[PDB]
Design a protein around this ligand. Structure first.
Ligand SMILES: Cc1cn([C@H]2C[C@H](OP(=O)(O)O)[C@@H](COP(=O)(O)O)O2)c(=O)[nH]c1=O
Ligand SMILES: [Ca+2]
Length: 129
């Protein structure tokens, strides 16, 4: 897989963000994770985390997997990086997302994220407290 450029348009919540990709505004849904909705426990904390990571980044990138690049709602499906750090993985390591929605053929980073989830669960962080 490879990273491609994007720029931040606006934070949305823990697992969605509005980015400009190839010069067009699009909402992205982060692959392989599920954050609580804003109205649920840890939803606001997940939103704050990804808003900070994205807004402080000098360089945002997106990486598509091998499979579907948009979902049935027209959201782009990717892994998002902020100054080289994967947001998807960071959420999971902090106990602010569960590994979820693992569909065959868009699951390249599944085991990386499961290892983060195991470390978050060991530490009893956030969702795992
Ligand atoms: C992460 C992801 C979600 N989706 C669809 C499955 C879920 O359908 P339903 O809306 O029918 O539940 C929805 C979950 O996203 P949200 O967690 O953003 O609500 O998005 C995909 O199709 N592919 C994906 O990789
Ligand atoms: Ca969600």
């Amino acid at each position: 897989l490879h990273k491609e450029p994007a720029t931040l348009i606006k934070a949305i919540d823990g697992d969605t963000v509005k980015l400009m990709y190839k010069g067009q505004p699009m909402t992205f849904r982060l692959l392989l994770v599920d954050t609580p909705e804003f109205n649920e426990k840890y939803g606001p904390e997940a939103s704050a985390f990804t808003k900070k990571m994205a807004e402080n980044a000098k360089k945002i990138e997106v990486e598509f997997d091998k499979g579907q690049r948009t979902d049935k709602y027209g959201r782009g499906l990717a892994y998002q990086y902020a100054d080289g750090k994967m947001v998807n993985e960071a959420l999971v390591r902090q106990g602010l997302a569960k590994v979820a929605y693992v569909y065959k053929g868009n699951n390249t980073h599944e085991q990386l994220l499961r290892k983060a989830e195991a470390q978050a669960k060991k530490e009893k962080l956030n969702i795992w407290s």
